[PDB]
Design a protein around this nucleic acid. Structure first.
Lengths: 73, 388, 131
RNA sequence: UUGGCGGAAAGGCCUUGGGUGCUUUUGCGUGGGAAUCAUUUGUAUACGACUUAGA
RNA sequence: GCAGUCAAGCGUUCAUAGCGACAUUGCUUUUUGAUUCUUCGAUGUCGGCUCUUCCUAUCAUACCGAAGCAGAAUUCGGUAAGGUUGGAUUGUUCACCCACUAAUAGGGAACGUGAGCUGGGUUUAGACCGUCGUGAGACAGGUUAGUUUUACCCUACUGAUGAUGUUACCGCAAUAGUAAUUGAACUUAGUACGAGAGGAACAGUUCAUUCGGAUAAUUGGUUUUUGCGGCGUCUGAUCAGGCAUUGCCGCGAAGCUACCAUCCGCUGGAUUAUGGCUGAACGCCUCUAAGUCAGAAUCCAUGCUAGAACGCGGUGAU
RNA sequence: GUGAACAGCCUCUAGUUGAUAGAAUAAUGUAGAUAAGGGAAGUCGGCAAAAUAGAUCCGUAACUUCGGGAUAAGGAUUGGC
């Protein structure tokens, strides 16, 4: 099979699809969809909240604060 | 030249005149292929319904390009093509004045189908209680057969009365679309016989067409309604700022001739015209299951034909299907009739077939490709998603 | 030749384009295409791989106010491949050929599409990047 | 009654043998055995049409 | 404007590869004049746009002839009506001029085209300048500004409907219109052909123009279903909304069509010019006279759409 | 009343729902928006429409009757708190 990979959405691009942008600086971009491409022009980062696309990791929240702290012996 | 310097082809063809409503809902093929090969196991045509469109990936061929070799995508129209009842053999004879039918030979079983023959085909939908089909006239196949004996003493190119059994899935409609399909093949006496064997039983798409083979598609276009010159003919709007009439022609004709010719572009009807689009490669014939699907990997992976949610406004396909190359005329949920290519010829064109990598299936558009992503989304939802 | 793929025409006559090489030329204006034919009130348009006649608006002085032909290397408007993928470039650019084939500059700057490269092997020889 | 021929259908007919004889419509009467609409809608469509479902 | 005859002459020599005077006969009606037939109870002007149909005196493509055709660019000519860019200047027609092209032909249809548009010029009323005129005012002198009415009765036709008849479907096919064009490149070949320089054909191959038809996977555009950011003002507040274009503004979908998105387009039979066959009148010769073979993008067929009022049959029938 | 750059929206003033409605929503048309990418090629004419936009800071050419040209030009900045 093929697939391509989205340098924006992070997601795999399904075979027989996507658009390739060739830029002046000669970086090569693969955009899965036109949704993806527009936002890259706009200079919306993908980490920023585009779907939210490229996020979807995990890790996160606290436990435990109380006191961010120092002195108080 | 009095005018124009500066003269261009006339937009819009005179052969696709009149641009008028079709006589019938269903396309009718005027002539068919010739009697070259095997007997009437070979029906000249088959019918179906346009489901939507999908795209497929295939092993190409055209050695001259550098782009030649590997998988390459090609457009497909999917048509659901159920087993069709050849009900009868109609005998049309050639004479001078024209053909007139000698007979129709009936099978024992058309039962709902004759009710559908009564629907528009007679008229009135369960309206007042009947409509009627007369019963097989106390075993008087003899009437039908003596009339069969009459067809063998000459020659239509032997023909068959057919219907599409629409009830299968996508159409809310139950009513059959009756068809005249020509039979072509070998010697005439065996031709009557094979045609005879066929009526006794239903006929599949597997019997008529081989995969990849060149099929002419005839169907009836999408209907706009009543339309102006610009969409119809493809003529321009007149830009200006101001116009008494904006999207206009300048002159219908000239001072002489006094009359608006038919040859000139005019508003009127558009769409719902018969049209024949020629030499379509039949990429796949099959069933959703269990002819097969896809290998796995490889050649390439198993994929049900429908896109998720169904094709818009069609519904879902789950039965016999035929994948045809490119476009096919009509909208969706319309009869398309398939014919073996009339046009001998022969030239180059597709000269080798095209090994099935993919259907599509998608599972895409912000997710996909099927098995794994549906599982992946399901962990994440979960409740509204499927499974629980 | 066959370019062997199909593109939709970016540039009508009178378009402002980058000059892809260092011939001295910074900027072309497209006068004609070598091989288009057209219809009434209606522009000839060029696209990727075409042989064009251009004038260099900014450009050598000798080349300025001169007409010299160029082949369009890059285009902002989409190219559609045999595989099916759509490819685009940031900019519109060409390098200055003769219709004869004779020179004007040593090297290229920025990428060229593989399709342009097949067609004109002498441009391709001076290519940093092929895409 | 028997039947062929034509022409495919119809028709239209035309032949070899025996039982009786000759030499276009318009009703008063007798005998014999489905559409279009409403109502939901379209694969439509200006009005109509078509198309479609109905214990 | 174009053609025919004649052929002085020139073309190294050679009338006729090509060019071709004098003279001379024609033809067309599309420039110009001439006229005064038509219209002064009113024919809207030039030009341009766009839509159509045509013509042949053919610019290209097809087939062919000749050459001062080695190839090869070519020149001239026959048959032949099945594409003929986009721009700059100008109101311009015309033309000039630029890059393209296979080549960017010419002519008509009330100088086709104002109950379609345009309104730049001509051609009202104000004004300036040159010139002329005592002046008023005038110029085929120049210049700036300077209006575009009408709700279709009939006809014509796109399309839709639509009874007689025994009924509904399905089909036939009299016929009508009738799509294929063209280029580039590869193989073939650095070959034939040629001193060399250069540089073909044929077919098989791939692709693109240009046209037509169609479609909505692809992917563009749309998106005033709906959901979310953020601006002012308002219901106490947030929260929830309202108004601000017909969507407040910014962000995107299905459907609908296109950014050449995307799919599909010959052979026979008859012929023209001609080149041949058999072949006389005229014992020979002769491609035609009787006969006949080939041979165009031609014709027709093939291919498609429409098609029972050609005054229709089945079938399926109450 | 909030704005004072015009605009818009308001509130206990107060005033009204124009002499036609209903069903749908085709082309044609009239107001109107947005359009790929290209960017005056269109048209007599860039006509319109888009476009620019407030204000602060910095900066500001030829020419000139030194008054002006000038908001030349060009660029930057601005929230919610």
């Amino acid at each position: 099979m093929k697939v391509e990979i989205d340098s924006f959405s992070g997601a795999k691009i399904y075979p027989g699809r996507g658009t390739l942008f060739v830029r002046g600086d000669s970086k090569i971009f693969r955009f899965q969809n036109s949704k993806s491409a527009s936002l890259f022009k706009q200079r919306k980062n993908p980490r920023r909240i585009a779907w939210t696309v490229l996020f979807r990791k995990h890790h996160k929240k606290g436990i435990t604060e109380e006191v961010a702290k120092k002195r108080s012996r | 030249m009095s005018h124009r310097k500066y003269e261009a082809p006339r937009h819009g063809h005179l052969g696709f005149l009149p641009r008028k409503r079709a006589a019938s809902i269903r396309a009718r093929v005027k002539a068919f292929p010739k009697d070259d090969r095997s007997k009437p196991v070979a029906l000249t045509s088959f019918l179906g319904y346009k489901a939507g469109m999908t795209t497929i990936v295939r092993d190409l061929d055209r050695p001259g390009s550098k782009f030649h070799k590997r998988e390459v995508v090609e457009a497909v129209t999917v048509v659901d093509t159920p087993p069709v009842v050849v009900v009868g053999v109609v005998g049309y004879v050639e004479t001078p004045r024209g053909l007139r039918s000698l007979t129709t030979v009936w099978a024992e079983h058309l039962s709902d189908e004759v009710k559908r023959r009564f629907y528009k085909n007679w008229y009135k939908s369960k309206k007042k209680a009947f409509t009627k089909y007369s019963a097989k006239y106390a075993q008087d196949g003899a009437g039908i057969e003596r009339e069969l004996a009459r067809i063998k003493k000459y020659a239509s190119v032997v023909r068959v009365l057919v219907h599409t059994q629409i009830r299968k899935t996508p159409l809310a409609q139950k009513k059959a679309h009756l068809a005249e399909i020509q039979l072509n093949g070998g010697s005439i006496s065996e031709k009557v016989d094979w045609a005879r064997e066929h009526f006794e039983k239903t006929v599949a798409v597997d019997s008529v067409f081989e995969q990849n083979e060149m099929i002419d598609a005839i169907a009836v276009t999408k209907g706009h309604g009543f339309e102006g010159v610009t969409h119809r003919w493809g003529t321009k709007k007149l830009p200006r700022k101001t116009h008494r009439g904006l999207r206009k022609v300048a002159c219908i004709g000239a001072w002489h001739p006094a009359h608006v010719m038919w040859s000139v572009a005019r508003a009127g009807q558009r769409g719902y015209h018969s049209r024949t689009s020629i030499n379509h490669k039949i990429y796949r014939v099959g069933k959703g299951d269990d002819e097969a699907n896809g290998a796995t990997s490889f050649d390439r992976t198993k994929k049900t034909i429908t896109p998720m949610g169904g094709f818009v406004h069609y519904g879902e396909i789950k039965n016999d299907f035929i994948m045809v190359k490119g476009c096919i005329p009509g909208n969706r949920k319309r009869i398309v009739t398939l014919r073996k290519s009339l046009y001998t010829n022969t030239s180059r064109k597709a000269l080798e077939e095209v090994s099935l990598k993919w259907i599509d299936t998608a599972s895409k558009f912000g997710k996909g490709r099927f098995q794994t992503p549906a599982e992946k989304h399901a962990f994440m939802g979960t409740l509204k998603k499927d499974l629980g | 030749q066959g370019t062997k793929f199909r593109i939709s025409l970016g540039l009508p006559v009178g378009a402002i384009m980058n000059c892809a090489d260092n011939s001295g030329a910074r900027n072309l204006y497209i006068i004609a295409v070598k091989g288009s034919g057209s219809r009434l009130n209606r522009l000839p348009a060029a696209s990727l791989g075409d042989m064009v006649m251009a004038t260099v608006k900014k450009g050598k002085p000798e080349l300025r106010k001169k007409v010299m032909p160029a082949i369009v290397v890059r285009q902002a408007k989409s190219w559609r491949r045999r595989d099916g993928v759509f490819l685009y470039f940031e900019d519109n650019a060409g390098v200055i050929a003769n219709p004869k084939g004779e020179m004007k500059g040593s090297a290229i700057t920025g990428p060229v599409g593989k399709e342009c490269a097949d067609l004109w092997p002498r441009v391709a020889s001076n290519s940093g990047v092929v895409v």
